[PDB]
């Protein structure tokens, strides 16, 4: 089903996805333990992820949700990082992609902060870091994030210090952090862009 | 200078800290008024607090106390709840964090019962409860406690009915004399005598 199409760096679509990726980088309270130390990325590639059957699975679920929420899908574009980005662009999101111990309750997690999703590229907590150097802050190995179309519908607003289709994990302390979100059905997200980058060591 | 490092639920360090939380829940004489009604917590996250500077400030004070007490720091792990948990992990403890009207005197209070420290998450007596529902028994909103390394030194034993250190003492141990299920509470006078080692984020859990 799945084909990847390169966006040229000169394409406006490449440029708006890049800018979203760069501009939603923030400092993390772990000092970069999980995701490494950086303020921006070297963007290597941006690919549109085209799969007709996964896309129809998304629009169909989107429909159902809009119709349970006064015609409002409450659709966002959000980041997702995972060691399973390959399975996801081929087979779609599903239960095995759910973060069981997630801070806002078991489900599939998405972030407004690209740098938050970056923390999960090598697994929970950055796991053991890159597979080549075991370096969570590796500046050499290439990473991927997905920039995804997510249907939130009626979102349960949860604060950190049934009748809902998602949870919004609002930040409270950390007046720097953006929102995180959780869906319970894989069909409510579609992995539209695949972004290959390095994190860049600061000056 | 503070960094917070997540511990994994599979880490035995995570597990020891959680069990310390859970196993020290008790009934309170307020029926849950200040801290809410619960028998256990839902632990969302445990982070180690790393800050090289506050840590040296802690150990320098501990050595002093230890020496003044015949080489016994009398160091414990104790809970602390406070609306200012975020400041404390950055700045450490100082006299801003002293409960002036505390039962065992003006100073900085620590509990062996996690549920006792939980009564202070939203202020003394639980203030007006969570910032969003104004509900002191809120089962939805996230709370944080600190589990801290605390130097007692020579501790003055004070019995209860339930500023400046006492004469040549480095702390007070407050021991409830009526209720023997209640565990001890402690007071220090110097912020440097405590280090916030873990930050635990949790919800109290509704019982059935
Ligand atoms: C590796 C895996 C997992 C866990 C969490 C995340 C993840 N968690 C997040 C939490 C907050 C914000 C973003 C993310 C995010 O982009 N990704 C990704 C994959 N853990 C798991 O049980 N299934 C997964 O797919
Ligand atoms: C809010 C504040 C305060 C007062 C009491 C407590 C507190 N009091 C306790 C008393 C007994 C046992 C534990 C605690 C405990 O964990 N925390 C914490 C903060 N009052 C204050 O003057 N400074 C504070 O930080
Ligand atoms: Zn590497
Ligand atoms: Zn609340």
From Swiss-Prot, chain A:
Zn(2+) binds at residues 130, 133, 138, 141. It comes from the Eukaryota. Residues 8-203 form the PARP catalytic domain. It is found in: Cytoplasm; Golgi apparatus membrane; Nucleus; Chromosome, Telomere. Oligomerizes and associates with TNKS. Interacts with the cytoplasmic domain of LNPEP/Otase in SLC2A4/GLUT4-vesicles. Binds to the N-terminus of Grb14 and TRF1 with its ankyrin repeat region. Interacts with HIF1AN. Interacts with RNF146; this interaction leads to ubiquitination and proteasomal degradation. Interacts with NUMA1. Belongs to the ARTD/PARP family. This is Poly [ADP-ribose] polymerase tankyrase-2. The gene is TNKS2. The chain holds residues 952 to 1161 of 1166 of the full protein.
């Amino acid at each position: 089903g799945t084909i990847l199409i390169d966006l040229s760096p000169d394409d406006k679509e490449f440029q708006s996805v890049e800018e979203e990726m760069q501009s939603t980088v923030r400092e993390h309270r772990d000092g970069g333990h999980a995701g490494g130390i950086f303020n921006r990325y070297n963007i290597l590639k941006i690919q549109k992820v085209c799969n007709k059957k996964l896309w129809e699975r998304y629009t169909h679920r989107r429909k159902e949700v809009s119709e349970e929420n006064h015609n409002h899908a409450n659709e966002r574009m959000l980041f997702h990082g995972s060691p399973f980005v390959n399975a996801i662009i081929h087979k779609g999101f599903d239960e095995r992609h759910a973060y069981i111990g997630g801070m806002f309750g078991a489900g599939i997690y998405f972030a407004e902060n690209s740098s938050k999703s970056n923390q999960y590229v090598y697994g929970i907590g950055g796991g053991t870091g890159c597979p080549v150097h075991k370096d969570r802050s590796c500046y050499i190995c290439h990473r991927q994030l997905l920039f995804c179309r997510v249907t939130l519908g009626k979102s349960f607003l949860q604060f950190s210090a049934p009748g809902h289709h998602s949870v919004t994990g609002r930040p409270s302390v950390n007046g720097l952090a953006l929102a995180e979100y959780v869906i319970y059905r894989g069909e409510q997200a579609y992995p539209e862009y695949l972004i290959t980058y390095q994190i860049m060591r600061p000056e």
